[PDB]
Amino acid sequence: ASLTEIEHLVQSVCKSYRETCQLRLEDLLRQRSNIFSREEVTGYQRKSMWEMWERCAHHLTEAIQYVVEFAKRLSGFMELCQNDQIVLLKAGAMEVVLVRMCRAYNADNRTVFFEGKYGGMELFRALGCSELISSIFDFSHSLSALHFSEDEIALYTALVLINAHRPGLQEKRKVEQLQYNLELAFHHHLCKTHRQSILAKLPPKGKLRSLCSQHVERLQIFQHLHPIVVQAAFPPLYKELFSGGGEKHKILHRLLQDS
Ligand SMILES: CC(C)=CCN(C(=O)N(C)[C@H]1CC[C@H](c2ccncc2)CC1)c1cccc(Oc2ccccc2)c1
Ligand code: NA
């Protein structure tokens, strides 16, 4: 790689992210005053556990679909073989979503934008997975302290996805080369903007790994309690990525062949 090749990669990654960021940051910032009232919070707590699980799985599935589009527009991703594209998305799409979520998190009052308004952890009490919920809020709180720019989220989420250590990669050297160029693009941009200090403050990879692991652990607990709800009302892509065995569906393959 070269310098001009890396500067071109920065603008390419940022462009691919702007086209797929799902929610406008300005919209999220303007809605900070719009907070769920105590009566609305009580309504969410009164909903059944299985209805809250269905709505959250639907919101995650929608967010993951924008991450799949981010990957398809990400330089070098479609050059990889279809096995490696699927391995990288199965392992990283949820992680990219968890990072993108800090844009919807307000560290001032410890609330998150959810279904039109901002609400705290107590909004999600009906799910019956308080440890997972608090972990999600803590992770978003950690990233808020860094004051990420939009270009920084673009370059960082690209690296979260292009991880040459994921098990099952067939062309490991090809993914290594792509990750190295993206790492250079990230660091070059942090150097050009005098933001290298955040490198030591980025969360360890095990933090994103623990979140995904908790989500699968809590999903299995819920699937045991309401199996027909998962079977009949959860999104098919969600079941393919997270529920055992849900893998037979082949939705990821269709999203990648499309468009
Ligand atoms: C449980 C909870 C606190 C919230 C429900 N939900 C959720 O808010 N989302 C998916 C948003 C993720 C961030 C998205 C976005 C995109 C771009 N810019 C800003 C934000 C917008 C959708 C969510 C979060 C994280 C794991 C998750 O998976 C679960 C969790 C519990 C049960 C089932 C699935 C859902
Ligand atoms: Na934030």
Swiss-Prot record:
Residues 5-243 form the NR LBD domain. GO terms for biological process: adipose tissue development; cellular response to sterol; circadian regulation of gene expression; lymph node development; negative regulation of thymocyte apoptotic process; negative regulation of transcription by RNA polymerase II; Peyer's patch development; positive regulation of circadian rhythm. This is Nuclear receptor ROR-gamma. The keyword Nucleus applies. One of its GO terms (cellular component) is chromatin. It is found in: Nucleus. It comes from the Eukaryota. GO terms for molecular function: DNA-binding transcription factor activity; DNA-binding transcription factor activity, RNA polymerase II-specific; DNA-binding transcription repressor activity, RNA polymerase II-specific; ligand-modulated transcription factor activity; nuclear receptor activity; oxysterol binding; RNA polymerase II cis-regulatory region sequence-specific DNA binding; sequence-specific double-stranded DNA binding. Induction: Up-regulated in the state of obesity. The AF-2 (activation function-2) motif is required for recruiting coregulators containing LXXLL motifs such as NCOA1 and NCOA2. The chain holds residues 265 to 507 of 518 of the full protein. The keyword Metal-binding applies. Signal peptide: none annotated. It is linked to Immunodeficiency 42: An autosomal recessive primary immunodeficiency characterized by increased susceptibility to concomitant candidiasis and mycobacteriosis. Candidiasis is characterized by persistent and/or recurrent infections of the skin, nails and mucous membranes caused by organisms of the genus Candida. Mycobacteriosis is characterized by infections caused by moderately virulent mycobacterial species, such as Bacillus Calmette-Guerin (BCG) vaccine, environmental non-tuberculous mycobacteria, and by the more virulent Mycobacterium tuberculosis. A motif (AF-2) lies at residues 237-242. Changing F114Q: Completely abolishes transcriptional activity. Nuclear receptor that binds DNA as a monomer to ROR response elements (RORE) containing a single core motif half-site 5'-AGGTCA-3' preceded by a short A-T-rich sequence. Key regulator of cellular differentiation, immunity, peripheral circadian rhythm as well as lipid, steroid, xenobiotics and glucose metabolism. Considered to have intrinsic transcriptional activity, have some natural ligands like oxysterols that act as agonists (25-hydroxycholesterol) or inverse agonists (7-oxygenated sterols), enhancing or repressing the transcriptional activity, respectively. Isoform 1 is widely expressed in many tissues, including liver and adipose, and highly expressed in skeletal muscle. Isoform 2 is primarily expressed in immature thymocytes. Keywords: Activator, Biological rhythms, Developmental protein, Disease variant, DNA-binding, Metal-binding, Nucleus, Receptor, Transcription, Transcription regulation, Zinc, Zinc-finger. It comes from Homo sapiens. Belongs to the nuclear hormone receptor family. NR1 subfamily. Interacts (via AF-2 motif) with the coactivator NCOA2 (via LXXLL motif). Interacts with the corepressor NCOR1. Interacts with CRY1. Interacts (via AF-2 motif) with the coactivators NCOA1 and PPARGC1A (via LXXLL motif). Interacts (via AF-2 motif) with PROX1. Interacts with FOXP3. Interacts with NR0B2.
